Design an enzyme around this catalytic site. Structure first.
Site, short mmCIF file in Angstrom:
data_model
loop_
_atom_site.label_atom_id
_atom_site.label_comp_id
_atom_site.label_asym_id
_atom_site.label_seq_id
_atom_site.Cartn_x
_atom_site.Cartn_y
_atom_site.Cartn_z
N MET B 39 14.43 29.51 36.11
CA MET B 39 13.53 29.92 37.29
C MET B 39 12.42 30.80 36.51
SD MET B 39 15.80 30.46 40.44
CE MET B 39 16.17 32.19 40.20
N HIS B 43 12.51 34.91 28.86
CA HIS B 43 12.93 36.00 27.80
C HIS B 43 13.80 35.23 26.79
CE1 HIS B 43 16.96 36.38 29.70
NE2 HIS B 43 16.33 36.56 30.83
N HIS B 46 16.56 32.70 27.66
CA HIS B 46 16.14 31.42 27.71
C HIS B 46 15.91 30.82 26.39
CE1 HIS B 46 15.20 33.65 31.57
NE2 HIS B 46 15.81 32.70 31.90
N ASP B 81 2.46 32.74 30.59
CA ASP B 81 3.12 33.29 29.47
C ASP B 81 4.48 32.31 29.38
OD1 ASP B 81 4.30 36.88 28.57
OD2 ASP B 81 3.89 34.97 27.22
N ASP B 82 5.11 31.83 30.46
CA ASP B 82 6.41 30.85 30.50
C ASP B 82 5.66 29.81 29.52
OD1 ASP B 82 7.92 32.60 31.71
OD2 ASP B 82 7.76 31.49 33.59
N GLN B 85 5.36 30.44 26.00
CA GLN B 85 6.56 30.68 25.20
C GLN B 85 7.40 29.22 24.97
OE1 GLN B 85 9.29 34.38 25.86
NE2 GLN B 85 7.97 34.08 27.65
N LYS B 153 25.70 33.94 30.85
CA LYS B 153 25.50 35.00 31.44
C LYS B 153 25.99 35.07 32.85
CE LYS B 153 22.94 38.98 32.61
NZ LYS B 153 23.77 38.91 33.95
N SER B 189 18.37 40.22 30.94
CA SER B 189 17.99 39.97 32.19
C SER B 189 16.82 40.41 32.80
CB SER B 189 19.17 40.31 33.21
OG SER B 189 18.89 40.31 34.47
N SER B 190 16.07 39.64 33.34
CA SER B 190 14.91 40.07 33.94
C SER B 190 14.98 41.30 34.62
CB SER B 190 14.13 38.95 34.50
OG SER B 190 14.95 38.33 35.80
N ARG B 191 16.23 41.69 35.24
CA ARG B 191 16.31 42.78 36.15
C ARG B 191 16.32 44.28 35.37
NH1 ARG B 191 19.03 39.56 40.66
NH2 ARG B 191 20.89 40.73 41.01
O1 LIG Z 1 19.37 33.67 32.88
C1 LIG Z 1 19.37 34.61 32.01
O2 LIG Z 1 18.83 35.72 32.73
C2 LIG Z 1 19.90 34.62 30.77
C3 LIG Z 1 20.24 35.68 30.29
C4 LIG Z 1 20.97 35.54 28.81
C5 LIG Z 1 21.19 34.34 28.40
C6 LIG Z 1 20.84 33.12 29.15
C7 LIG Z 1 20.44 33.23 30.24
O3 LIG Z 1 21.39 32.04 28.38
C8 LIG Z 1 21.94 32.28 27.39
O4 LIG Z 1 21.89 34.01 27.12
#
Ligand SMILES: O=C(O)c1ccc2c(c1)OCO2
Ligand SMILES: O=C(O)c1ccc2c(c1)OCO2
Ligand SMILES: O=C(O)c1ccc2c(c1)OCO2
EC number: 6.3.2.1
Lengths: 289, 281
Positions: B39, B43, B46, B81-82, B85, B153, B189-191
């Site tokens: 989505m 980071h 991904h 930026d996506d 990367q 995750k 996590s983006s959070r």
């Molecule tokens: O979707 C994520 O935030 C996420 C976060 C960490 C991950 C990942 C996905 O795939 C394997 O390590």
């Protein structure tokens, strides 16, 4: 293995078997055609088979599976006609190379877990008092498409609501298959062919012509408009002895949240004793032809 | 005429039909098509997904970037930026469809997940997983990959995708990729950037609780749970929504054998999740 004898009827029960054979045929350049059925084949099924056959370099897969998920509790499932010997005989006569005859256990090893939820059309017409019915149809057709991965899939216009829902399935899930609708085959009096027609006694069989007569009368009356079309159909049905009309509805061709404008479909469902019959026809409003 | 594809370059397509055609054509040229659904706001988590996909011989990597409206309640967006990367990773296909392109007839036919979808994360968000399985099915049908890559995750999501695949007879291998973590163990996590320093320090309790539990597990299931609970109990401002030991398919935990321990917690307005493999005894 699985073995594939070309020019003969090969019957597979294992999803993996038909999936492998299909994958192999498609890789050698043959185009894979799927005709999903619940068996009890009649001449209208054979028209589906013929249309698939006529696709150049096709290999024809006919599935026979009385899908339990499309039946509501009570005795509909147990009461469905089963004639395996005639079915397979008919397919050989037609030069079908593949019959796919999966078990319930192979199709539903985890019972009802992930399923297809149709759009709001599933809640109408046939789905009205049968609100899980099309989820059942669409769940099974999705599986059969994933198992066989055909180029084109063939359905009759007879179960027209089902055809529309299947085109919805295909569109909404981005399925890489062409949906081919095939015009309904009729007895010489007009009666739409159906595996349910065996349950009409001589009196009911005679009365049953009223469905197709009502629809063709409406299709001709339609130059005079919607009301005249509907009333002509109603008049015929009302003249017919022991035909209990469920619904008679005139809809846009997509059956959906759009008004009838010009091109439509007239759908009927009626009971003759315990036998529920369906038929439908194209309608053009204000069109003489 | 198949859309233009340039080998070794990032090729961006927004039209579902275009990536479908390029993908099909590529598979015929002797490539194995690898899909990594995202989505966006990418980071290192991904990137681990991407590298897993890249290493498969003959791989062509498809990364989808689509904020699925249907898995949000009945957001970061960094397109440039996506894409940069993915370019730096040597990814050759990005699929960036619009909501309109994905849902042209609106919400009509959808996937109804099984009963697992109402549990755990489906408590707060009862429709979330229907939204995810619906878009994942569509992506699978569009791209037709040999393998699809998801993180561990979102473990419950990954199990539900495995159910989708079995249950619909999908011809794709689902590959689970282990969680990438911050230096102190916090699952990426983006959070995470939303946590204030107090919360960010307390947030390390989720991973610590899980790793404690995994090591306590030689003393059995109850030791593991009690260990995990202890670590979370040492943290302030960490509202535990659940802590559950399940089997690896997320059914009941068997007497001994493999399982999975899952936790979710709210720190202020931020919901964090983590999970770990557990071997009982
Ligand atoms: O979707 C994520 O935030 C996420 C976060 C960490 C991950 C990942 C996905 O795939 C394997 O390590
Ligand atoms: O399934 C049927 O009963 C049926 C009945 C008649 C048909 C047909 C299918 O396809 C074309 O003509
Ligand atoms: O990176 C590899 O050498 C490699 C080689 C073969 C693989 C694979 C990775 O994933 C599954 O099949």
């Amino acid at each position: 293995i699985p073995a594939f004898h070309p020019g003969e009827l090969n019957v597979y029960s294992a999803p993996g078997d038909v999936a492998d054979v299909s994958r192999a045929l498609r890789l050698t350049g043959r185009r894979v055609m799927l005709v999903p059925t619940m068996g009890a084949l009649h001449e209208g099924h054979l028209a589906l088979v013929r249309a698939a056959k006529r696709v150049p370099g096709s290999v024809v897969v006919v599935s026979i599976f009385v899908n339990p998920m499309q039946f509501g509790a009570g005795g509909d499932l147990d009461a469905y006609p089963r004639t395996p010997d005639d079915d397979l005989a008919q397919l050989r006569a037609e030069g079908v190379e593949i019959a796919f005859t999966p078990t319930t256990a192979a199709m539903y090893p985890d019972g009802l877990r992930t399923t297809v939820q149709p759009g709001p059309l599933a809640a109408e017409l046939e789905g009205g008092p049968r609100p899980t019915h099309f989820a059942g149809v669409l769940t099974v057709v999705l599986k059969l498409l994933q198992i066989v991965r055909p180029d084109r899939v063939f359905f009759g216009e007879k179960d027209y609501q089902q055809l529309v829902l299947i085109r919805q399935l295909v569109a909404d899930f981005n399925l890489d298959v062409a949906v081919v609708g095939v015009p309904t085959v009729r007895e010489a009096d007009g009666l739409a062919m159906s595996s349910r027609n065996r349950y009409l006694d001589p009196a009911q069989r005679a009365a049953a012509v009223a469905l197709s007569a009502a629809l063709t009368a409406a299709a001709h009356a339609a130059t005079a408009g919607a009301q005249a079309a509907l009333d002509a159909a109603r008049a015929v049905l009302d003249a017919a002895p022991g035909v209990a009309v469920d619904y008679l509805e005139l809809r846009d061709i997509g059956l959906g949240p759009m008004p009838l404008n010009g091109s439509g479909r007239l759908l009927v469902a009626a009971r003759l004793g315990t036998t529920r019959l369906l038929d439908n026809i194209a309608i053009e409003i204000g069109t003489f032809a």
